[PDB]
Design a protein around this nucleic acid. Structure first.
Length: 43
RNA sequence: GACGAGCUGAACGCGAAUAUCUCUUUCGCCUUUUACUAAAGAGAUCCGCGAGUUUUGCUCACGCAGUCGCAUCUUUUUGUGGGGCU
């Protein structure tokens, strides 16, 4: 009938799924549809 | 034309030692979840580690000092001299 609304010291409990991982982002390079590469062509 | 041991800082980098975890999958335990198995991958973490001057702490030490702004017989520094012609 009505869901829970999810509004937002800090607690020091550390989850296992919250440990560092995939700590850098991949960006699209030349050759993977990067934005500056794709203005150049007629799609 | 010339001199370090120990600690914390460095900011850059992974000889031989290696454990844990997370995720995405498969496989096996198999009632369920933990807790596990063993494969494929993708990611972290731990415990450590090397060099640059920063000096803190020596308990060592220094300056007419090791170095300064190849030395007479045929092939090299002991030259073959002197004159004069267009």
């Amino acid at each position: 009938w009505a869901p829970a609304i999810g509004g937002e010291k800090p607690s020091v409990q550390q989850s296992a799924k919250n440990l560092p991982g995939h700590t850098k982002l991949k960006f699209r390079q030349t050759g993977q549809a990067a934005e500056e590469e794709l203005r150049a062509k007629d799609l």
